[PDB]
Amino acid sequence: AQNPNCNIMIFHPTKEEFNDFDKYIAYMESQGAHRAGLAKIIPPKEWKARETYDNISEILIATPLQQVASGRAGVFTQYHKKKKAMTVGEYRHLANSKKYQTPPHQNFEDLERKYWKNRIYNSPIYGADISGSLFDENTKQWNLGHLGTIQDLLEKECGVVIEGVNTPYLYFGMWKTTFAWHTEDMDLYSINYLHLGEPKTWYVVPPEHGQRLERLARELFPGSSRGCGAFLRHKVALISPTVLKENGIPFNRITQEAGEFMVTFPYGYHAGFNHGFNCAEAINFATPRWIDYGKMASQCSCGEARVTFSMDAFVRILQPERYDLWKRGQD
């Protein structure tokens, strides 16, 4: 069995290997990459996402989110308070202000220590989930707006034609902006490209061990767990690496830098934080290997998770027994 310790693997495809996206994902899985839940892909030196980032300041962040924490430094939730619209140029200036800027630090490890010590005492503002793309239309390789759609994959594998669309999303971050512990909708893959700016640190639990994280989360967030049998779908709970180690939860960590891709694999729980002002693009995708994970994915039916239009068909076709309950939670 390849990668039996479930380490995060790093790949360096050549320009020739960068042509066929599906083939390269299958190659990484042949080497055991999916066992970690997360892989890094460094693009060949010949490749670029677009020519420059000099002209992005007029993008609008319609609903910036202030991420307010509750709990203790290593075990907390966050809620999202909506703020007034601002442009990317305005948000960049805000991220660089004395109130929000990255503190002086020695290295990534010192910054990670400072994040976990101090995160709860601040409320950073995140531009999340903005439909759009920063890939040039002429970029033919690993262009996250030109991937094969999940609806087409389901149709190819299973024969059933369904409604829905699959487009990318932009994320504008600052120091301490936080992504809570989660798997993707319907335990899909994700791919994330860091277009510009400061790094993103990731934490990940191997898919084969995801239920260990879920059982800890139920212990640590006992009111939330009574409220919903899949409350990590709410995307609000944080648990630090120190607390995971104290509780014996298998996990790994890695830092993504600008110009790098990360792939999350089906049922790979992940969480993390941004180091300073940055911009990422991400989208969900599927492969044949995903179908069995989609059929078994948990679902939130309590009302909190609320998701895209396109998840309807995935539930309806893959999980018909759960469909009526889940749809009630959507309404």
Ligand X SMILES: O=C(O)CNC(=O)C(=O)O
Binding at 58: pick from Mg ion, Ni ion, ligand X, none (beta carbon under 5-8 Å per type): Mg ion
> In the range 226-265, which residues lie near Zn ion by CB under 5 A?
228
Closest to Zn ion by CB, 177 or 224: 224
Quick check: 282 binds ligand X (CB under 6 A)? yes
Closest to ligand X by CB, 188 or 331: 188
Closest to Zn ion by CB, 42 or 302: 302
Closest to ligand X by CB, 111 or 280: 280
Listed residue (292, 329, 331, 299) closest to 315, CA to CA: 299
Binding mask 32-71 for Mg ion (x = CB under 5 A): ------------------------x-xx------------
User: CA torsion sign, 128 to 329 to 207 to 166?
Assistant: negative
Quick check: 143 binds ligand X (CB under 6 A)? no
N-terminal to C-terminal alpha carbon distance within the chain: 44
**Closest residue to Mg ion: CB criterion:** 58
Binding at 174: pick from ligand X, Mg ion, Ni ion, none (beta carbon under 5-8 Å per type): none
**Closest residue to Ni ion: CB criterion:** 190
Cβ contacts of residue 109 below 8 Å, gap of 6+? Answer: none
> In the range 184-203, which residues lie near ligand X by CB under 6 A?
190, 192
Q: Kindly state the tokens that stand for 167.
A: 């487009």
Minimum gap (Å) between residue 229 Cβ and Zn ion: 8
Burial of 18 (0-12, 13-18, 19+ CB in 10 A): middle
- Given the rule CB under 5 A, which residues bind Mg ion? 56, 58-59
- Given the rule CB under 6 A, which residues bind ligand X? 171, 179, 190, 192, 264, 280, 282
